[PDB]
Symmetry: D3
Subunit: 239 residues, 6 copies
């Protein structure tokens, strides 16, 4: 290993400069296999990595785990190995009535309901995706005949209280987050997830490109496509 | 009038749903005359408003004044009259050595060094432009042969201490803003201006589209006005097509 | 010009050290004509400036525009030209049912609902008026046989949600400002306007004098949407220059 | 008693509506004795209280103890008993180089370096004195041939790190307060004390009047704490003169 | 004196390194007299100090006054004179419905509702007691047959609005503290007092040991303030407990 | 499964009310096999769980993953299945020079350099361990001849800038965190890790007991980059609490 967590060496990446970063270690192989010559690199903790080839060029695929702290480790260590572009593919719950189950959201920027983003910039800095990569994701969507919801995502350090879920052992939500779902809804926020605010703030401040695409699993008011889009998006950027 | 500061009624706008929003009232007529049948609407305080037509569609041109507070009045009152799209055009000073004078900046999102943004959403919320409008701005630049710098802008409630200027009467910068220019520079921030954080945050939270383009007039580390006004007019056309 | 925005030089001020600073550029002329030898100086963006004379002494009258960001520019640049005293004259919405439309409010200190103030001092610092200048404003009221309604003013970076106005496109206010008008009311706060927190914090921190009088144009216990003040601020200037 | 800490009943105040509030319980009798018919009311914890008469009018003198939390109990319980005006008389450290030992400072408003003020209003609210009472203090100074320093005071929950004293066991100050004396200095701030931010904020928000005069005991551009080398009209005489004016 | 407020010199402490710090100057004598050869030292402002001897070792007993800012001066000045261990003994309003009047509460850590603690470390730092001293307090309670209530305590710069008391002149509490009592109750917080946040944060950051035990004088689910109807105090005594804890630590 | 992420039902836990919670999924088996009848329950995402018995008492062993957010899911979902005590066993970097690589730290309470703790209580609430469980951990060290460093831990949402590591791509640390290591050192804080502030705040507010022991793998006074001691202690501690 040349990096402490991932178990990777710069040579293992074969000059890859772009990473696809799902949350789940168990989804990394299946993403890798949509491209050419997929090969297992390593597995440690929540970090499962593969290499594969998109229209000739190496792409590393590596899981992040759930949440900003585990994401910030993967992104830093990948970047130590020469990665400069991070495409997140994921799952999400929608909070707008017009965002249907099975739909696709491309996150342009995020509400910072996380703590790791503050380890890169004070809260005034916007958690904003790279314009070129977001453009690539949108065009990959439309190629698939899917018009994506493009907008703001609430990115939370918790799955329960910070997404204002009451279906828990205590049934309690702290004052800060009580009433919060309706607040984001009113402001046009599309969905909740748990990594984009760290991912975006850290890449913007450090000089790397990031974007995020997600298939909607649930809608709080009432996913092959997503992986196929992110691979299409990667090939656009590498072309 | 329908609206208390602008002195406008809805009928006056002839169905316009898109405003170009420069900072200076004296630049309003100038922008309006790039389009057809420019016509004075009203002038009160720092708010001068014209109607013109862009490829046959009605467009409002209205000044905001300097800063978020005056901007927030213009945008709300225009939106009361059916405007839903706000395109900001201006001049700016760059903080990155490779952003030369005569370059163009398209602001994708802003550092919130302002107060009025917080009257729309808590600080966690991003001060981000509409993707569709930002896309139009960038296409408008490229049609004119300009590759814009697209990125993050620091949006300040002050021209002097919030932009870490020491060329003032006291020469003092309060602790919060001491060393702050270097901090934004290291984060890739491109420039300082004084309205985008308010404009972006209020539009994103209230359901309106916003974007911002500016020509670089000075670089803190080291024709362009006409260029930026030309670009915003071309983006308006694209959006209304 | 000797300064970046105003279009003025030090010589144009004829040695004035005191400015009257209305919000509205369209009020500067009226103010100046209450004094002697009123002379147009400049007009750029929201900054219209006149000079006039009070009992032989030059006074500059210059607008700030609406809100702290434009105010911070006018104040700094006039201070560049030797002004050290800034008497704001404005309009205001009363929030206490005892204050009537047409009454005058002298702002001793302000709730900092603005952002420019923080570019001069952290929030713990009081947005407080100069004692001598406030004193002069209160006296000018007494001479005119009017109540000066002296107290605390909420100074907001917005006219709409930060003053908890609901007759708007979306009809909503963000959480921070929902209920906020009732909170200031209960705390005895008199009124809303949009410049005094920035003006006071900047003058206090930078060694300049400031004060603020405003005419009440609406009472918010009744409704959201809406010369005395101007004669008082002129009277006060004269007292300070005597 | 009819309040929980001070040990007082409304009848004990003989209709007083104005209090003089020093920090030290050991100063209360001396202040009371500048007035007429000084009489002990109670003493419990740090709260010593006297009644006396100012040009025929009743006045309660009651100590606050050091800091906003103890002050807030005093001011609330007095106000339960019908007090509506609170004149603090204190001691202070000057932070500007020519505000001398023995001078008096009249505090117009305060930097809120306390926690108790936040239990009355969010930090955006100014910790400002009552205009009427501040004017009377200024007037009482001038009558005595003292021109007071009138301005802004830094009002601190600590005597040591929050006033940037370093002659302490660890000799360290936490990051927030490191360099903070220079920031207040540059801003024209006159002095440090430890009660005015809480007193002013609680009074403005609750509808009571308040003011603050204090004598300088040290100049911090010179010394951290006074000693026998430090220089030798009292603030106590000024506050009693001010009270007479307000109740006339 | 060697210090600016307390009126004490190093010699007067006779080498003492442990202080009992009650909030009230009027309790100091009584505490002192539970030990040997109790002797008055000094009294200035809110600071009354005695010396006594616990199994032959010197113990200083000094009041803090109400609230963190007064507490902070006493703790600093005592440490200037060689004290390194501070055992707070106080009174407290229980906020859980079956923590009864007359029970003892050993505070292990504190909600920081004060401002003096921020003068020692940013709010993210925990206001936590010394493990050894808390252990001695718990042990002193059990020796005495009292199972203490060990947990978290809300430590407030005010007695009225910050403890959500409404029986006041205005009968209003600012937005931040409206509904706050219910918030702490839901989180399992046991009680309110007014010193432990400041004392714990300053001691942890400066390298000194602190602990806090307090007797319950009201239950806030019952009454805002106690009266003659309130349960009367039992022979269970927080002052006896603190003295017994001191002895364990000095042994 | 009766919970959304862990893949568990209540019946699978055999009545267990205490969990040992390491950060690494690969550590779960190793911990379980220090106990009796180690039994695989589930593996999903970063969440690997075993059941085992501690002197006859059932105990769940479930990874949290790195960081508060993943920790918060595991703690909540276990508690839905009847777990009420959470003993974290981890690794840590020491920031005090007297702490050696290989020593154990028992965390009494944590500096909240995390964001998930704020999803349970505002920042004034102390990130403090359960007194009983901390005392059991101290006793287990003592029974094993190891002196626990008991104190305050800085618990950070990042491994790099928030622990003021400079050997990174950009080698920059944001203003808030520049000089922070020295600040903590000066305040007597022992060590950095990445889960305790979330764990402690969420348990204390929710009515559950939590404690945390970690083995020192690096001393930051010397360098930035670096079971079975720590794990032995947490198992011994579990036995104490369920007796
Ligand atoms: O309710 C009101 C009425 C007037 N103003 C003042 O008048 C201008 C807006 O009409 C602003 O400069 C502000 O100073 C208010 O803030 N609120």
């Amino acid at each position: 290993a040349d990096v402490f967590h991932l178990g990777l060496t710069k040579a293992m990446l074969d000059g890859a400069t772009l990473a696809i970063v799902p949350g789940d270690p168990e989804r990394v192989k299946r993403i890798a296999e949509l491209m050419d010559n997929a090969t297992f690199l390593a597995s440690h903790r929540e970090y499962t990595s593969y290499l594969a080839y998109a229209d000739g060029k190496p792409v590393v695929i590596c899981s992040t785990g759930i949440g900003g702290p585990s994401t910030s480790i993967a992104v830093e260590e990948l970047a130590q190995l020469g990665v400069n572009t991070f495409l997140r593919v994921g799952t999400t719950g929608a909070i707008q009535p017009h965002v249907n189950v099975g739909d696709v959201i491309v996150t342009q920027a995020s509400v910072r309901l996380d703590g790791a983003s503050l380890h890169f910039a004070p809260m005034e800095f916007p958690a904003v995706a790279n314009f070129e990569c977001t453009t690539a994701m949108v065009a990959a969507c439309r190629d698939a005949g899917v018009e994506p919801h493009i907008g703001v995502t609430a990115s939370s350090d918790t799955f329960y209280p910070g997404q204002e879920r009451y279906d828990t052992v205590t049934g309690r939500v702290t004052r800060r987050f009580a009433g919060s779902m309706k607040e984001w809804q009113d402001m046009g926020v599309l969905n909740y997830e748990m990594e984009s605010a760290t991912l975006f703030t850290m890449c913007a401040t450090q000089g790397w490109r990031a974007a995020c695409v997600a298939g909607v699993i649930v809608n709080r008011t009432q996913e092959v496509s997503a992986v196929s889009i992110v691979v299409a998006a990667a090939k656009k950027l590498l072309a």
